[PDB]
C-alpha cells in the first residue's frame, strides 16, 4: 500500500540511508509493492535461511541426513556461537545446526553447514541453479560480495518455501525453523497482532546494515513475503529496529 512506501521513504530520510523493500504475494508470487528492488544490500545473517534450503536440498537428494552428527572444536568456534559453543564434546546434528543458524543466528553453525555443502561457492551455485543469478555468498564467518537484492531474495525465498524445489517435509522444516526465530523480537514481530503467523530471519551488519526476510499473514497462516534491508546509516541498532517495526506496522495496518 502506498502509505507503506511512505514509511520506507520516511525511514530512508530519518536514517540517512538506503532502504530496500519487497512485499510479495506468497500464493501468486507477484509483487504487491517494491522499493529499490534491484539494488544490492548486504544479506548479513539472512543468508542462513538460504544455506539451510541448500542443506535440505541435499537431504531431499539423500546426499545429506538431518540426523547426521558433526563434531568440531574450539578451533572452529567464531564470535557469537551461543549454541555451538555448548556442544564441543557431544557434537551437533545437521538439523540442530540449522536450528542454531536460523533460530539463534549461530555463526559457527553457519560455517559448519557451509562446509557440509562445499562452501559459499556451492551455495551460490545452488542459488544460481534455482534461477537466482543475483544473490551471491562469498565468505564464511559498495562491495557486491555477500549481497542480494530485495527482489532476488523475496523470490528465492518464495521458491524455497512454496515452490517446486523442496519436498513438502523440507519446506515445512525450513518454515518451522524460521517460525522459531528467537533473535528478531523487536522487528516485524513487534508489529504483529495476536494470532498472526510469522516465520523470519533477521540480519545486522556494520555501517548500519539491518534486515529481515519473512513469511507472514493473518490467523495462523502465511500469505505474503516481506523483505527489508537497509545499509549506510550511522544510526543505533535500536533506531534501525524501530524503523523496520514501523514499516511493519504500516503493512499490517494496510493489509
Swiss-Prot record:
The keyword Cytoplasm does not apply. Keywords: Antibiotic resistance, Disulfide bond, Hydrolase, Plasmid, Signal, Transposable element. The keyword Hydrolase applies. GO terms for molecular function: beta-lactamase activity. Changing residue 79 to K: In TEM-3, TEM-4, TEM-6, TEM-8, TEM-16 and TEM-24. It catalyses: a beta-lactam + H2O = a substituted beta-amino acid. This protein is used as a marker in many commonly used cloning vectors, such as pBR322 and the pUC series. Gene3D superfamilies: DD-peptidase/beta-lactamase superfamily. Substrate binds at residues 201-203. The active site is at residue 45. It is an enzyme of class 3 (hydrolase). PANTHER family: BETA-LACTAMASE, BETA-LACTAMASE-TYPE TRANSPEPTIDASE FOLD CONTAINING PROTEIN. Belongs to the class-A beta-lactamase family. TEM-type are the most prevalent beta-lactamases in enterobacteria; they hydrolyze the beta-lactam bond in susceptible beta-lactam antibiotics, thus conferring resistance to penicillins and cephalosporins. TEM-3 and TEM-4 are capable of hydrolyzing cefotaxime and ceftazidime. TEM-5 is capable of hydrolyzing ceftazidime. TEM-6 is capable of hydrolyzing ceftazidime and aztreonam. TEM-8/CAZ-2, TEM-16/CAZ-7 and TEM-24/CAZ-6 are markedly active against ceftazidime. IRT-4 shows resistance to beta-lactamase inhibitors. The beta-lactamase present on pBR322 was cloned from plasmid R1 (R7268). The class A beta-lactamase family has a specific amino-acid numbering system, sometimes called Ambler or ABL numbering and often misspelt as Amber. A multiple sequence alignment was used to derive a consensus sequence and then the consensus was numbered taking into account insertions and deletions. This allows use of identical numbers, e.g. for active site residues, despite differences in protein length. UniProt always uses natural numbering of residues, hence there appear to be differences in numbering between this entry and some papers. This is Beta-lactamase TEM. It comes from Escherichia coli.
